Design a protein around this motif. Sequence first.
Motif, short mmCIF file in Angstrom:
data_model
loop_
_atom_site.label_atom_id
_atom_site.label_comp_id
_atom_site.label_asym_id
_atom_site.label_seq_id
_atom_site.Cartn_x
_atom_site.Cartn_y
_atom_site.Cartn_z
N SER A 105 3.21 5.70 -3.15
CA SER A 105 4.40 6.36 -3.66
C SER A 105 4.45 6.36 -5.19
O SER A 105 5.20 7.15 -5.77
CB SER A 105 5.66 5.67 -3.12
OG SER A 105 5.71 5.73 -1.71
N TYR A 130 -3.00 4.96 3.33
CA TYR A 130 -2.54 4.26 2.15
C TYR A 130 -3.71 3.64 1.39
O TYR A 130 -4.74 3.29 1.98
CB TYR A 130 -1.53 3.18 2.53
CG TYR A 130 -0.26 3.75 3.14
CD1 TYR A 130 0.66 4.43 2.36
CD2 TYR A 130 0.00 3.62 4.50
CE1 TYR A 130 1.81 4.96 2.91
CE2 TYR A 130 1.14 4.15 5.06
CZ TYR A 130 2.04 4.82 4.26
OH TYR A 130 3.18 5.35 4.82
N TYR A 165 0.83 -1.20 0.00
CA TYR A 165 0.00 0.00 0.00
C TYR A 165 0.86 1.26 0.00
O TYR A 165 0.57 2.22 -0.72
CB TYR A 165 -0.95 -0.03 1.20
CG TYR A 165 -1.60 -1.37 1.41
CD1 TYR A 165 -2.14 -2.08 0.34
CD2 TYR A 165 -1.65 -1.96 2.67
CE1 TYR A 165 -2.73 -3.32 0.52
CE2 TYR A 165 -2.24 -3.20 2.85
CZ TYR A 165 -2.77 -3.87 1.78
OH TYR A 165 -3.35 -5.11 1.95
N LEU A 166 1.94 1.25 0.79
CA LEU A 166 2.93 2.32 0.72
C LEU A 166 3.50 2.45 -0.69
O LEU A 166 3.60 3.56 -1.23
CB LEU A 166 4.05 2.06 1.73
CG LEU A 166 5.35 2.85 1.56
CD1 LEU A 166 5.13 4.33 1.84
CD2 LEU A 166 6.44 2.29 2.45
N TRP A 167 3.89 1.33 -1.30
CA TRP A 167 4.52 1.39 -2.62
C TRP A 167 3.54 1.89 -3.67
O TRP A 167 3.95 2.57 -4.62
CB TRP A 167 5.08 0.02 -2.99
CG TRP A 167 6.17 -0.44 -2.06
CD1 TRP A 167 6.93 0.34 -1.24
CD2 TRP A 167 6.60 -1.79 -1.83
NE1 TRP A 167 7.81 -0.43 -0.52
CE2 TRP A 167 7.63 -1.75 -0.87
CE3 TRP A 167 6.22 -3.03 -2.35
CZ2 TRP A 167 8.28 -2.89 -0.42
CZ3 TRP A 167 6.87 -4.17 -1.90
CH2 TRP A 167 7.89 -4.09 -0.94
N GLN A 171 -5.56 -0.01 2.52
CA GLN A 171 -5.11 -0.53 3.81
C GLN A 171 -6.27 -0.78 4.77
O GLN A 171 -6.23 -1.75 5.54
CB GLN A 171 -4.09 0.41 4.46
CG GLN A 171 -4.67 1.53 5.31
CD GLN A 171 -3.66 2.16 6.25
OE1 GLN A 171 -2.64 2.68 5.82
NE2 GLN A 171 -3.96 2.12 7.54
#
Lengths: 69, 751, 73, 80, 40, 143, 141, 73
Positions: free
Chosen positions: B150, B376, B145-147, B379
């Motif tokens: 980003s 995110y 989710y971070l990736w 998430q």
Amino acid sequence: ALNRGDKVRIKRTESYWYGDVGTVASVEKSGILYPVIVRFDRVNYNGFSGSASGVNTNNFAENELELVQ
Amino acid sequence: MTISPPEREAKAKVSVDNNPVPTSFEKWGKPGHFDRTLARGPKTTTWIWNLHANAHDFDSQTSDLEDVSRKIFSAHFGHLAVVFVWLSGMYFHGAKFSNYEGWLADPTHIKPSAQVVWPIVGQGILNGDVGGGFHGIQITSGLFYLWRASGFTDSYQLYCTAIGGLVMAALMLFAGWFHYHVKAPKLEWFQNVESMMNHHLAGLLGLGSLGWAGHQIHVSMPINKLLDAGVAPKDIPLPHEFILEPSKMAELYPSFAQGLTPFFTLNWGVYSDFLTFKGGLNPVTGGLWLSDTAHHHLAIAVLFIIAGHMYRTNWGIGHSMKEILEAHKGPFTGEGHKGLYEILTTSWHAQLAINLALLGSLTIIVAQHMYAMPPYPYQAIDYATQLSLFTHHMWIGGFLIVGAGAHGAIFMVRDYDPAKNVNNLLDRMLRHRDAIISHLNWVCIFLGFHSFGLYIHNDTMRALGRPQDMFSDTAIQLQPIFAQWVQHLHTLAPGATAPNALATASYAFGGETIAVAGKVAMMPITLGTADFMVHHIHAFTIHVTALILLKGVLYARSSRLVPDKANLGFRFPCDGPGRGGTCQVSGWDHVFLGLFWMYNSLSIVIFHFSWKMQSDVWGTVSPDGSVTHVTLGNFAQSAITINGWLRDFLWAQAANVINSYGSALSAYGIMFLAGHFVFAFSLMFLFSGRGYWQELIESIVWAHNKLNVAPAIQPRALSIIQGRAVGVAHYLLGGIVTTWAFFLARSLSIG
Amino acid sequence: DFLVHHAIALGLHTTALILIKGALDARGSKLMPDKKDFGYSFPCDGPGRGGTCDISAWDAFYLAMFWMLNTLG
Amino acid sequence: SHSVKIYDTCIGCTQCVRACPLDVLEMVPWDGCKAAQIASSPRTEDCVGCKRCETACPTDFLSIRVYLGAETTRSMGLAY
Amino acid sequence: MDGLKSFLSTAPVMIMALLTFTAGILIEFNRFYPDLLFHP
Amino acid sequence: ADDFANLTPCSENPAYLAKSKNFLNTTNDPNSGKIRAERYASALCGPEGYPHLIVDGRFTHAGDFLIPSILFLYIAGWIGWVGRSYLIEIRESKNPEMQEVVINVPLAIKKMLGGFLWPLAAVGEYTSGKLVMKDSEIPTSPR
Amino acid sequence: MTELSGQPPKFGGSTGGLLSKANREEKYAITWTSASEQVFEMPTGGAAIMNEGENLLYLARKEQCLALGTQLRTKFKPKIQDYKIYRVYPSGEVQYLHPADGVFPEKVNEGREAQGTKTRRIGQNPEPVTIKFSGKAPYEV
Amino acid sequence: AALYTHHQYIAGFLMVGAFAHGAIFFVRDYDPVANKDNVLARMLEHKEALISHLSWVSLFLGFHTLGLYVHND
Ligand code: CLA
Ligand code: CLA
Ligand code: CLA
Ligand code: CLA
Ligand code: CLA
Ligand code: CLA
Ligand code: CLA
Ligand SMILES: CCCCCCCCCCCCCCCC(=O)OC[C@H](COP(=O)(O)OC[C@@H](O)CO)OC(=O)CCCCCCCCCCCCCCC
Ligand SMILES: CC1=C(/C=C/C(C)=C/C=C/C(C)=C\C=C\C=C(C)\C=C\C=C(C)\C=C\C2=C[C@@H](C)[C@H](O)CC2(C)C)C(C)(C)C[C@@H](O)C1
Ligand SMILES: CC1=C(/C=C/C(C)=C/C=C/C(C)=C/C=C/C=C(C)/C=C/C=C(C)/C=C/C2=C(C)CCCC2(C)C)C(C)(C)CCC1
Ligand SMILES: CC1=C(C/C=C(\C)CCC[C@H](C)CCC[C@H](C)CCCC(C)C)C(=O)c2ccccc2C1=O
Ligand code: SF4
Ligand code: SF4
Ligand SMILES: [Cl-]
């Protein structure tokens, strides 16, 4: 009767080294109760909690040392 | 003499010593070299343990403040290099052992996985089918989710990131070696607290969020704008194409047609299409609007850069923190903050106590803010990630807080100078420690009686067939009316006290029910009698942990029982069986007890989170609009008794953990039993004492001497302090691993 | 039944070990050669000689009670 | 009050008295050891039983022994 | 130097090296001959 | 005769056959489950279909315990004997504790490589008086 | 024991000092001379200032007085070794305590009578069975 | 079930108490000169061997029973 360098076995019962062997470092003069100074390879339990090692020398009387060498 | 660069100072307060410690390997083969009580070598097994016990106790190795500072600085560089290795490892496993691109193409029908297990001795079953033909371990760290937020779309970008992380680790390692051995900065340099604060505010936190606002605006935002529009990740341009072809940005954001001119002329409103104040969540992903987070990081950057100008350095403008502190004194507090500047500029432990306390509190704030304002994409719908991240940050915060207690105590024993603290805040704290602690003691007793006691009252009333005599929403009500009122205030805010905001800051306070796919991402989290009772449980357990650690710090020097405790040190077992018995008077033992109480507090916090989210928030929503929760709204009637928690929470939800055998969740049952075993094992060390074990060792040493196999390094039972340290380490490890296996099996087996 | 019988054997042997070693060292050990002078029950012998918590034979009884309960469980 | 006894293995190193935080013990003339001194415990009414003296003793098993006894306000170390 | 060899011959390094070697032995044996509950 | 009537050969046991047609693959070999079924069809199964090991000492089931027992005992005696031998050899080196903490790799490897003869070595030390010590020469606590 | 003299240390107060025991039961006094007005640590918590010249301080226990005394003789650049510790009763009786005979107990001083001495080893205590149903313990005989 | 559990718990308490009072005997009543070289003193004389072999069989049973259980798990 003991001399520096004598290997002796401890016979004090209550001593940490009863049955173990030490070496005589010096013999003190008469009039003293425990004149024979013995050094040991294995330290005893002496020390506050967490201390690295212990005491490796103690005074005895001739009747408490048994000559091995 | 190693490498000798030119100099590298530009009218700077930089001051170093060249080559104070030559690079050499000899001491690597001389274990315990740093401790004089260890250098000669071992004679008993205790020598081994202390070698690890004192490895980082730089104070106890040298009395020179400058050398301690240098050791600390290089250790920080080494620790950063370790963290870099770890993070690049995460990114590498995302590049080479994950289904990241497949998950990205369809994140509602595939479970994120980024660890593939080799097939051996049957353990290959852990490679569960996570969708799209991918088989592996389902990850709950939220890395995917971070990736996605980003703007990662390819394995090669993750691989390049992992390589950059490895290079960064190498750079940090070299910097640590360089600043310990080649150019070691002087004590005068570390004590430049005003300059260090200016730089950490404007430069580390301010420029950090500024650069991240840049990346979010130029990479994250257009790419996610296209991702949520349904564009396949392969059809989306690469991040640098939006910077080479500004027309792409301009058509995704018309304000880009005007460029930077509106920025420099204070015409910021033109930017309103990508610097937003929407509030709420993204309807496609369930996460915070990335445009909101970019505007947020821009404003945070401006704030921190402005803040980085308060303190005086080389130019007369700015503040002396010593002056500010000395000016703050009142009729109730003597000399006030006089002496604090000298404490916090000569004592590493004082700084570490402050910083541990605040960093732990911040990690807890992070858990609490990230669950209800999910930042995110996707998430919140992944209940396992949600639960895992909340609990993980909780535990990290609790450990940091307990460490803060530890280092307040170490400051009191080692660095407190009474001649430098005459009638200042610290001195007066010491001078009414009794009032403070007796009152905290009573508040804890009152909070325990009127929280846990309410549960006992309810259990007893319900067992007696007397439901109308209980504390509940349907009997004698304990409504948390102030929290309800603040929730209402937050819900009204978008239209009154937050006009330029479109939605709420969080739907937990009230409002719509945001659901992505068939599952709810967030919805109003209502508060009633059970919530009142558990909040007072939280206040109670936090107060008891604070009681223990604060008593540890305030009595580290002395007490009526032991007036010379300071001479005994920070860490020591007692002062004998006399005075009735003085075991556990040290600050270290207060930390040891506070560890258990923090574990208690946080266990209840995370159980509360799990049960309340499963009962009243999480669930699946029908196309008709209605919601059906994971545990069918059972919290209000069941969480008001201990039996309810034992049966409807622990017993009911443990069914997934204990039935995990024969599936990919089997390792979670394995580690459930493992945590149980480690918990039970810790009780041997906590319930006993070293004398028994030393005598047992005597008998076993006799056995060895009988066959001429006794070691020269004589075996000793663990020390009293170490018995406690082992016991508490195993208690926490076992209990936490138990809850971890339980939580993961549950949250992975609930849709 | 085989496995649980060996668990019972472990429990019996361990409780017997605690109890017998407490009894035989009740008069003295190398950590306390004069323990008989202090009585069956006493707090400890202090943080000296390495530390001596749960050093008495009463303490051995107390430790073996847990293994008795475990074996019975 | 606790009991404090001093046996004839005393080498008179004075660490007994140096460790006592309550001044229970003394160095008194003697002849059994080289140092011509032995430890004494004339003020056991102030003894609290912390066992610091024995922790300080070097002889193979202590020459000074503290046996905890009848608890008083003083021996319980009470400031109230 | 002698320091690096002495560090490489310390108890923790040596025990972890032996454990890694034995782990490899047992792992590869059970990779090429798995599921040996008894001797046929 | 009719010994071990409570059990049946796994090739006879139908529950074992049904479960062995479904034996999972423990490695990469797509035949690991089938090899496992064939291999375990030789032991004695129970009503549930799992193999049961007979360790009363009969050589028809010698592979159920006797052979692994012999193997473990050889290896464990080897480890203990070479460790004790190195421990003895350190004692004559002035500072034995250091070589207990910082291992003499060449000496320790020399001792390890000579452990395959530890039964005869132990028998010789027993006869020669090197293995066991006398009671009156071993430290003991008060009685 | 005539009448204790000396200024009280300069101190703003604390909650860690005397309680009811001081007036109902017993309290303790420590006097000492200082060559300078200087800061010291109160065994009951915090910092205080000793006066140039004589100083008189009341504490709850003998141990707090001896802890302050060790601090005085081991933590000041010119040592303070003239401190005297007294026990004080509610009747007003003052009992000089330390140093008992005007000489610190760590060093031999003529005139002291051995107390609690045994003319034997620890291992030479008699068997408890030999003294049971008496009031004594092996170290009391 | 209740009877079996009850009586086994009572028996466990009794066994622990028997060993506790053997220890108390050694602390309070044992006369080494009257039992000199008899079976009691002789038990005391090799207490290291008794305690050590009890420890060994305890370790044996524990290691191997826990090993079989965890392997099966
Ligand atoms: C090969 C390069 C090298 C060499 C030979 C030395 C040499 C020396 N250093 Mg130095 N140093 C180096 C690199 C090096 N250092 C680096 C990279 C850093 C930054 C962390 C430092 C920072 C530093 C400090 C702060 C101190 C020394 C000290 C010392 C002396 C004692 C070392 C010791 O105790 O045994 C060797 C000990 C170890 C090898 C530790 C084992 C490894 C730990 C437990 C975990 C690994 C962490 C690692 C640093 C980073 C992780 C790597 C990453 C890829 C995961 C010694 C002469 C100490 C000193 O001066 O003694 C008075 C001292 O306090 N060094
Ligand atoms: C804007 C200048 C600046 C910045 C960015 C930092 C940043 C940092 N300092 Mg430092 N410091 C500064 C000025 C600065 N300091 C000055 C002037 C002084 C003298 C008063 C100090 C003295 C000081 C001490 C004594 C210590 C630190 C420590 C730290 C680190 C701990 C925080 C952390 O781990 O965060 C997060 C970590 C990261 C983001 C990792 C990145 C780290 C790299 C090397 C920074 C690269 C940025 C650089 C400016 C290049 C950017 C240009 C371009 C790429 C955009 C951190 C990386 C502590 C430390 O950890 O020591 C190593 C430490 O003990 N600082
Ligand atoms: C560290 C973060 C970061 C980074 C490195 C970038 C990088 C970039 N941005 Mg970006 N951006 C950021 C943050 C960041 N931005 C933030 C926070 C915002 C929100 C306000 C934006 C919004 C934004 C927009 C709308 C645009 C960019 C654009 C660009 C690109 C060209 C701009 C440039 O550098 O030319 C060099 C800049 C100059 C030479 C400035 C000189 C022009 C003025 C007149 C000078 C005035 C300066 C003077 C001292 C002030 C006095 C004025 C007063 C007297 C009137 C460039 C690669 C442009 C682009 O290419 O789009 C893709 C563009 O249109 N950015
Ligand atoms: C930035 C944070 C920080 C910093 C740098 C320090 C720094 C320091 N602390 Mg502190 N402390 C912290 C956080 C921190 N601490 C936290 C979070 C806690 C709560 C637990 C404490 C509690 C604390 C105590 C009680 C003590 C210290 C002590 C010390 C000093 C010695 C370090 C040491 O023990 O060496 C070596 C480290 C070890 C031997 C750790 C090994 C054991 C760990 C706990 C096992 C962990 C298991 C693993 C995480 C998971 C299981 C894996 C396993 C299955 C293989 C050192 C100066 C000691 C001291 O005396 O201070 C002067 C000491 O008494 N700290
Ligand atoms: C469930 C087990 C348990 C319980 C009941 C307690 C109880 C307590 N602990 Mg404790 N603790 C425990 C486990 C437990 N501990 C463990 C395992 C450890 C090891 C780490 C500690 C270590 C520890 C420390 C270090 C401290 C405490 C503290 C406290 C007290 C907190 C104040 C309070 O709650 O007031 C109210 C009391 C209760 C809520 C107990 C329940 C009362 C019931 C509900 C009502 C009673 C009904 C009635 C009286 C029955 C009478 C029957 C009639 C026949 C007479 C409290 C009495 C702290 C303290 O003392 O704070 C001042 C303190 O500092 N604990
Ligand atoms: C502590 C008791 C214990 C015992 C009795 C066993 C026994 C066994 N386990 Mg188990 N296990 C245990 C604990 C135990 N386990 C625990 C605690 C766990 C949890 C981690 C496991 C988890 C586990 C798994 C997952 C598996 C086993 C398996 C096995 C079997 C494989 C045997 C094998 O590899 O063939 C024989 C191996 C060898 C002969 C190689 C040993 C290396 C030698 C020394 C090589 C050197 C040769 C040397 C020269 C000697 C040659 C002869 C010489 C005299 C000439 C075996 C019957 C595997 C199995 O197949 O189950 C049936 C299996 O997959 N175990
Ligand atoms: C699950 C809880 C637990 C466990 C495992 C133990 C373990 C043990 N106890 Mg103990 N005990 C406990 C609870 C527990 N105790 C409690 C609550 C009390 C009351 C205070 C006591 C009081 C007590 C006393 C007084 C005595 C024991 C004794 C023993 C040993 C018995 C012999 C044995 O079983 O051999 C085998 C050992 C085990 C099964 C435990 C070890 C298991 C691990 C997994 C072995 C593998 C090693 C592992 C891989 C190490 C690497 C770690 C790495 C990952 C960091 C054994 C080590 C007796 C003893 O010492 O016997 C000689 C003894 O005298 N216990
Ligand atoms: C849910 C919250 C709503 C319920 C209300 C509860 C009321 C609680 C009492 C009010 C706070 C009193 C402290 C400020 C009062 C205050 O600071 O006055 C100011 C005074 C010092 O002022 P000075 O003039 O000396 O200021 C000089 C400064 O520069 C410092 O040198 O503080 C003190 O006197 C110290 C005594 C603190 C002892 C009181 C603390 C009691 C602990 C309990 C407090 C609970 C708060 C919980 C809220 C999170
Ligand atoms: C040589 C050696 C050492 C020491 C060796 C010594 C001193 C050993 C001493 C042993 C002693 C004193 C006694 C041993 C007694 C052993 C007995 C009594 C074994 C009994 C076993 C039976 C009855 C087994 C029966 C079964 C038989 C197989 C008979 C069946 O299917 C199963 C089953 C279980 C029935 C060290 C420790 C120094 C070094 C080590 O490396 C090895
Ligand atoms: C099988 C069988 C049989 C047999 C039997 C037998 C032969 C047995 C017996 C048994 C037994 C035989 C048992 C036992 C047990 C024991 C115990 C349980 C013990 C104990 C003890 C105690 C507990 C204590 C001790 C002591 C001490 C500690 C010290 C001092 C002294 C005294 C004594 C006190 C017959 C054929 C007949 C029948 C059929 C079946
Ligand atoms: C069992 C026990 C002991 C005995 C425990 C001892 C002697 C520790 C034994 C540890 C062994 C020697 C090491 C095994 C653990 C290793 C650290 C793990 C390393 C594993 C690697 C090889 C992979 C105490 O000394 C003690 C002291 C105070 C209170 C309670 C107790 C207590 O309960
Ligand atoms: S029991 Fe242990 S910790 Fe407590 S006083 Fe005795 S020796 Fe100290
Ligand atoms: S009591 Fe022991 S250590 Fe202290 S002076 Fe006497 S002989 Fe020395
Ligand atoms: Cl209920």
